[PDB]
Amino acid sequence: SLARAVERLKAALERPKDEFIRDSAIQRFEFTFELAWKTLKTFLELQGLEARSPRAAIRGAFQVGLLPEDPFWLEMLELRNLTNHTYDEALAERIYAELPKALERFQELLRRLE
Amino acid sequence: ASLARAVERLKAALERPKDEFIRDSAIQRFEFTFELAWKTLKTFLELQGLEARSPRAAIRGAFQVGLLPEDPFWLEMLELRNLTNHTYDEALAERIYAELPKALERFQELLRRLEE
Amino acid sequence: SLARAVERLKAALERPKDEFIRDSAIQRFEFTFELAWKTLKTFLELQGLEARSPRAAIRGAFQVGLLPEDPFWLEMLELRNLTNHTYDEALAERIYAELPKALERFQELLRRLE
Amino acid sequence: ASLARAVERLKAALERPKDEFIRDSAIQRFEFTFELAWKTLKTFLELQGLEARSPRAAIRGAFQVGLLPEDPFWLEMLELRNLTNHTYDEALAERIYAELPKALERFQELLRRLE
């Protein structure tokens, strides 16, 4: 349920920032981005389009006019990749700073998805 | 990066009263700490003159050289690491969180072994 | 450069076969396969996927449509792992007999990387 | 597996005029000879009751029991082995190759002593 995931990410971002809320927001962005590109695949495969990768799935969402040409999605893909190295706290802060924008794109995806 | 610092961060989250947020940040800390731990095993094995192109290989090599006690729980940790990516399923997140105190013990033992 | 690596592997396999040419070809297959799987890893990560091990990267290239589903890639992986046991000259010969086929795959990879 | 035949192969490659092919064949030969050598040292040390679970510990063990004389080049050979995996960089192939004559000598000493 992409919607539930998104709600969890929104709840973390709602709380006052401390290192635990920050890290919890990042963990939630991780599973939500995963569930999201997976759902874009499920959707693109219907209209006969191949995904097999988050970059391909995002690129397809732009073609089938689903999502609008928003380069932040590819930026989000990089962030999800950087979440592996969050043993670097300065990096964790950098990712966290982009989560609000990230949440915006997930919510716009839920609408356009239904 | 400091493995000690990653382990400390994980320890700080496990000592706190549990709630959804504390839970998810502990899982998040288990993720980069594990990531850093196998990378640390890889570097060590390579200094010994051995190779490890995967976390699985790094762990088994660590057993082989004695850098880690033969402990089947490390292999399970590798599996838990792969599962963190599907935590949109809270039941799974609760199952992972309950294994972290055990995971912490392993990281701490690795830290001890590494400075000998 | 993977291209220059493949180039060196080809130069060796075009030479008439004698033990020195044989062992140099095996040596060139090692670093070429090494540079090869790391190349895939870099690619997959850019697509938003994870490539932990050589087997992961190969399997990832398959699903992502980078490499065609060719079981020979996995066989090349095992030959890679047997290369330092070549004190066994019979093994050395067996690996060499497979290099022309390996080369095809490398060249195939170079072209599918555009 | 005969470590003697491995050394011999390394020796034969280093005796021929150098060219890109002879160079890489010598590197490939250094590669399996070092593999066989440390495994061989491992067998020897464990018959004496010592742990030798890695090329490093084998080398260290060899120095302890006196099999091999204190020689820092052995650990350098260990590192040269780790490097053979990155010879997609031709400059590294030349560095490694330049160190092989010396390497052959240590392998030759090991043999003589293992005797």
DSSP-derived secondary structure for A69-90: --THHHHHHHHHHHGGGTTSHH
Query: Best of D28, D85, D89 to disrupt the C interface by mutation (most C CBs within 10 Å)?
Result: D28
Output the CA angle B32-B38-B39, nearest 5 degrees.
Answer: 85
Give the list of residues 6+ apart from residue B47 with CB closer than 8 angstroms, or none: D56
Return the DSSP state at D73. H
Contact A30 B6 (CB under 8 A): no
On whether the CB atoms of residues D31 and D24 are closer than 8 A, the answer is: no
Taking the mean position of all CA atoms in its chain, how far away is CA B95? 16
State how far Cα C73 lies from the chain centre.
Answer: 8
Q: Considering only the beta carbons, identify the residue of B20, B21, B32 that sits closest to A87.
A: B32
Torsion of CA A45, A49, A52, A57, to 10 degrees: -100
Residue type, A61: A
Solving technique for this entry? X-ray
Among A80, A92, A97, which Cα is nearest to A23's? A92
Q: How many helices (H) and strands (E) does chain A have?
A: 6, 0
Which residues of C are less than 8 Å from B53 in CB distance?
53-54
Structural domains for chain D: 1-115 (1.20.120.330)
Resolution (A): 2.2
C27: closest CA of chain D, how far (Å) = 5
Distance from CA of C92 to the nearest CA of A (A): 38
Q: Residue D95: what are its φ and ψ, rounded to 5°?
A: -60, -50
Strand ranges (DSSP E) for chain A? none
Contact indicator for D34, D77 with CB cutoff of 8 Å: yes
Chain A residues with beta carbon closer than 8 angstroms to that of B25: 19-24, 27
Using CB atoms within 10 Å of the CB of residue C14, give its burial: 0 to 12 exposed, 13 to 18 middle, 19+ buried: exposed
Write out chain C in H/E/C secondary structure. CHHHHHHHHHHHHHCCCCHHHHHHHHHHHHHHHHHHHHHHHHHHHHCCCCCCCHHHHHHHHHHCCCCCCCCHHHHHHHHHHHHHHCCCHHHHHHHHCCHHHHHHHHHHHHHHCC
The CA-atom distances, in angstroms, between A18 and each of A15, A21, A96, A101 are: 9, 5, 11, 19
Query: Measured between alpha carbons, how far is D63 from C29 in angstroms, rounded to an integer?
Result: 35
> CA angle, corner B31, sides to B10 and B38, nearest 5?
100
> Which has the closest alpha carbon to D8: D35, D34, D33, D39?
D33
Number of C-beta neighbours around residue A112 at 10 A: 13
Distance CA C103, CA D21 (A): 17
Q: Which residue in B51, B91, B96, B90 sits closest to B78, CA to CA?
A: B96
DSSP state letter for D38: H
Enter the DSSP assignment of A45: T
Q: Do B88 and A34 touch (CB under 8 A)?
A: yes
Measured between beta carbons, the chain D residues lying within 8 angstroms of B51 are: 85
**CB neighbour burial string for A71-104, b if at least 16 within 10 angstroms, e if fewer:** eebeebbebbbebeebbebebbeebbeebeebbe
Rounded to a whole number of angstroms, the CA Rg of chain D reads: 14
Q: Which two tokens stand for residue D104?
A: 């052959």
C-alpha span between D16 and D19 (Å, rounded): 9
User: How buried is B76 (Cβ within 10 angstroms: 0-12 exposed, 13-18 middle, 19+ buried)?
Assistant: middle
CB contacts < 8 Å between B and D, how many? 25
Q: How far apart are CA C79 and CA C69, in angstroms?
A: 18
DSSP string over B45-97: HHHHT---SSHHHHHHHHHHHTSS---THHHHHHHHHHHGGGTTSHHHHHHHH
Integer Cα distance of B60 and B41 in angstroms: 10
Terminal Cα-to-Cα distance of chain D (whole angstroms): 16
